DNA sequence: TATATATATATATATATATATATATATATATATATATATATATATATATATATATATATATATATATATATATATATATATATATATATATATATATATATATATATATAT
DNA sequence: ATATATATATATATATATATATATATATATATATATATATATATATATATATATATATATATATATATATATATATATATATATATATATATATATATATATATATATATATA
């Protein structure tokens, strides 16, 4: 017993593992070059959607999850924030009432849900412009978040999940972390990438 | 893919395509040598067979749901589009609520799919005789719900 | 392809060509090894057989439509071209209206296909006896409709 | 239940998926080089017809669809615009009366149909010259679209679908988005393509 | 029903489709290299005859067919022009009387037949020199086409279809579209071909 | 990976993927040549089979633990998340304590997992009838403890 | 340089010319020896690639501005000169105000660019039909402003 | 350069000569070292290819203009020189007017090119049969105008 | 040098410019011969690589300081100039105090930089909405202090 | 490597890894060509087979030793760590003394391993019931000694 | 068609030359091979024990990394399947006729 | 016979057009939804392996020593002798081809007119 203690996260190689394994599978479908281009496009899409949104959200929110219900038993919070990013924002398929009802049914305190919804909104408005405009300039809090987001969702109908998928960021270009203004802070991460290839003779 | 009513053809199609996927999976790069050996070939064949069997056994409920939704559409003269839409709705309600009961009440999903169908819920339809008829979505929604509970014997 | 009256030869042609397509499909690249295995070969054979069977069972109505159009044209002595055209018309009207009833009245399709046949709709034909004759398109169009509804017993 | 949330769209790889899968299938018919040329021509045609017409129309209309009948239940609108681009334009096989009758029979408000038809006219005249000339210089609206399109269709006979298929763009060349005048705006999309291969050492 | 709307025409790949499929069939007869040369020569002949004559005539006549009897029910016009190219020209097997009688028997207005015969002659004289010399310098019209062509055909006996098949263009070389004079206009078609291979690394 | 109830398909999946890993292991660089030889191929196949058999034989106890946790959750109306969490707890406690007995008392692990489940230990849950219920974590923890010893007949 | 529509050719041109500039930079005088070494050559290649990649990534906004200016001009029938000038204005206002918001109100820039366009603000243009038309500068200026605010959804 | 009908040869000639120009461009002085590297070589190759593709795409209109001018001249038995001149005229009128509509009415360009053709506008040509014929420049100039408007369907 | 956001391009630029400086250093006068030697060339390459590596590893702290200063400015609507000035201040206070702790108390540096910012410490800023706001220099200086201590967890 | 109970998996693992080592051994550089030859391949296969057979036949004694050490620890409730340590002790004493008898008396090795086990020779262990127990190392050391002699029938 | 320039080719005798071949012996130089023994050099091998460096194996536990496998749900990327309709593309299949192309069948003359 | 031409004509199927239309399947959109996967997170827990340590042992192998001996082959000598080749010189003589002469022609190209 007690074999090991695995850790599941984005480890600066999930890109490569994904590309490699899927390439290996698809060579038996496409031939070399087609499989190459295919896995390239597949990972690019997966990156620009899932990484850019969900991973940034998870990294931002993890400390608050630990403060509130510090435990391995935070998985319900993770699925909650996932559905928040998907079901409510970018789709307006459900009102805050649904989530709060569901997770108090799942045993989560209400104000916790309200707080998490507030923060995920406060950061998602920074990530995607469309939500930032739909909510406008309102700081979310467990006292005002439910009413505001419920107004926003009911004002709109259910949007097709195509909005949640790709096109949202596709149509609108954004400031890079390689710009002036508020895009001059993070490339440190990418910076390492550069160093890496130089050391590998690349 | 285009709409095709389920038949044994679908079973065999899924079977063979799973054969291709598995032979791709095992020999991650050495697909050819793996393809040449008949033993791993038998193994992959049996695996794809088992997987097809699994997928079949976990689809009959959705099949019955689509059946009863088709019946309801026929008795209420609903065009194919909304037939498929209500099929999907019944599938959703049986999955998330009837079988697993995720923590959400019925009428909540009811109003959710109501907003899904709005534009607002009493659509007027012209039958083949030219007699226009109107139907409330929420009513026929609530109709198939109870009828569905009759199916599972809830 | 040139015209060929339906017969069992056509069945077998379709069967073998589907065999080729399926062996192409399963072994997406490794077609050779898949061709060497007898078991997947049996599976592909049975699949192609079932596919032919489906395609056959869903074609008899079209055959009956072409038959009655042939009878009507023979009764009106019409050159082959328009016989085939009216066969296609009967196919269209039974498919979109009689069976699935996409939302359109019959007379709408009637006038559509009329504009299809314009150039107006009373063409002159010279029989083998030298006696010229004339027939109205819209008349025979409606004429086969009633004959068609007689078939399905609508 | 609720396995996933799929999204169906042109994801900058459908070219590769199409080419690869059909190449794999056909190599058992042609051999390598012939299958290669075959899939090349096939995707070329499918691109320059379906992409250039239908996908541009869909990307233009999607926001208006969400405005009008914002829902997942917009599939009737999609099939409507498909039939409009095919059955009425480029073929003159059916008049506006047919579509409006059919879709009100399917439960669609008529003026909505008229608006959508007006807009698809206003954009197809931009995409295809021949339709722009058949309609001339008249802005369509749900007040006048039906009369004008009925005049145009009745003026013409049922045209052969050989027009709608390929020949339309084949016979007449158009201004590229790589030109002066009104061809100086979109290559941004294509631009990315170039960058991509440069990064791949291609 | 209403599964799809197929369009049958030359799509810059019928070359490859023909070559590939017949190669696949004939490998089981001749072996690789023999089947290769066989399909190469077969398609070359089919090209230089059927394409160069019938497809050019079809592309010329299609618009006028749509003007005259705009319909999908234009097939009788097509078989008419086919017989005209084969039975009357290049063989002198029948006089205009036979075609006009047969097609009015089939329900075609006479002056339509005369006009179509006039135009197909007016272009066939441009395509093939021998027919141009047989008719001389007379612009055909529905007022004079019948008498002219009847004189030309009755002046000749029935000619062996070997003329109509291959030999006609085989014996006499013509000005290429890669020339000065009246051969300096069309290579755009071939031009695209070249560009294509350069993009394929070919 | 997504949740999948254990079935023969899982056995076969593990089998084939271990085949790939082993053919990778033997021919560290010359994977192709090793892939070509049928004898080493037979050896690798049999090794993968043996390893799958090992992994299967050394998993049934965890399966029994997951079963009893499922029964307990079913009788106590617990959402899936905590069902899986308690499955994991039961696996841990049987492994480290019941089978190998690493040197630690039971109630110590009990309090450890209690702090694991805190936020405190009496959660409120809403059944399908709308009737809220409350359950103590430490109680049901201790509850499945006894039932666990009942299984192994400790 | 003459006006050329953006294209991949632009990307590659910028790439190569930056290559020349960088090979000039590194070997400040000993350009030949640095040109002879393939390693520093690969380094310079990747550097120029990165610079082009950046310049592409940070140009799409100005591109969309030019796009919407083009659409508006086409709708109001202006000769190319003022179309380019309004593209310039749109980029100005999005850069200084929309993105970084240097300390200046919108209407201030509006009047600034107005005096830029004066001579005097309702210009007359002769369309291709011979119908003269007039348009106010300040009006369409404010018009494209709101349109621009719509794009970023400001 | 001498008159040479457009052909694939032209495409390849432009391609290779642009290769030479680009390799001249990048290595402004160190052309040799740049010529030695295969990577920048691939870059330059793809650049020249893209440039040729651009130039090809932007020439079909002028080509069709030359085509219809050739057809008209053949119809009116005009010597090659004036055929080329009218080709150039059609290119001009489509470019400046039909595509971008620089601010000038058609008839103005017509009279411009009329003075271009004077010496005065009814030129007499002796056909191959010895039959002299006369044609008015202004007439045929107008003739190709309407014909041109038909091509683009203007 | 003008403001440029950090990026991989900066890494490469530092790399190449260090190459130039090193080749200048080694062959003090006969730099040409050293430039011709490939071995010393590899040595210089690896040297410049290690140099960039050092410089990068010794920059992340100041970068994070600039980041948090950017966040504070964003929440307090500060013009760019003062944002950069506070970035520099945070860099100074982490360097001299948090890392090495030269002999000076926090409030001493605080008042030093305050006299740096005087003219006196409550500046008026007019946001994009036209609403003027005021912020105390000393307050936010104290604010980023504790905030900085939070980052390094000091 | 992690602990794994001896089973056929171990046999096959050693077998294949020795295959890799041998194919590396024979073709010191030309590993590929040797890898392609099936005859030398059969040779290497049989060699690795014989090698595993040797290694197996030379391990049964150590297996029996570890078995009896396990039994003794079971009767004296000793944690796994010291179980493995005593297994190693027993293997040492059987090898160096019982089989080959290197020149050393038993009690000498006994005191050697005693100094190995000090910190000092009566360790206290708290059983699963909470009842602590103490055991003298030297006693059980001598105890497994004689028991070992009983096995070998010395 | 006419030159000249040399490139080869086919018809009969001299070069240096090597292509060799033989056919006869004699050399030196060498590649090997024996036949007896002697070295040094290194290739393994066995004998006994000792190191070091590794390759695995086990014996207990502990890590990180990973391959999977579950157990709960949630994503993303897909692979199919369905339910509704619509495309384009192509696989066939009809229904009428027309081509070319070639696959075989039906009237006399050559290979 | 099988197969190829030189005319006329079928049927048959191989494709290709020329229109209309099916059904089927190949993909692709368009929305809703499954189900099965391929991965990826998110926590918890296994199990099995790939490694890495953390101690103690094995066996096995790879090398290296530390002595003694083999046998085997790698070379090198020590002497006598072969045999086979690599050349070389001796003399005589063929044939073959590779270049150059010594005449007469070709044909073929490289040029030049």
UniProtKB/Swiss-Prot annotation, chains A, D, E:
This is Major capsid protein 1. GO terms for molecular function: DNA binding. It is found in: Virion. It comes from the Viruses. Heterodimer composed of major capsid protein 1 and major capsid protein 2. GO terms for cellular component: helical viral capsid. Its main location: virion. The keyword DNA-binding applies. The N-terminus projects into a DNA groove. The keyword DNA-binding applies. Self-assembles to form a helical, filamentous nucleocapsid mesuring 1980 nm in length and 24 nm in width. Together with capsid protein 2, wraps arounds the DNA and maintains it in an A-form. Capsid proteins probably maintain the DNA in A-form by non-specific desolvation and specific coordination of the DNA phosphate groups by positively charged residues. This certainly protects the viral DNA under conditions such as the extreme desiccation of its host. Keywords: DNA-binding, Virion.
Swiss-Prot record, chains B, C, F, G, H, I, J:
Keywords: DNA-binding, Virion. GO terms for molecular function: DNA binding. It is found in: Virion. One of its GO terms (cellular component) is helical viral capsid. The keyword DNA-binding applies. Heterodimer composed of major capsid protein 1 and major capsid protein 2. Self-assembles to form a helical, filamentous nucleocapsid mesuring 1980 nm in length and 24 nm in width. Together with capsid protein 1, wraps arounds the DNA and maintains it in an A-form. Capsid proteins probably maintain the DNA in A-form by non-specific desolvation and specific coordination of the DNA phosphate groups by positively charged residues. This certainly protects the viral DNA under conditions such as the extreme desiccation of its host. The N-terminus projects into a DNA groove. This is Major capsid protein 2. It comes from Sulfolobus islandicus filamentous virus (isolate Iceland/Hveragerdi) (SIFV). The gene is SIFV0035.
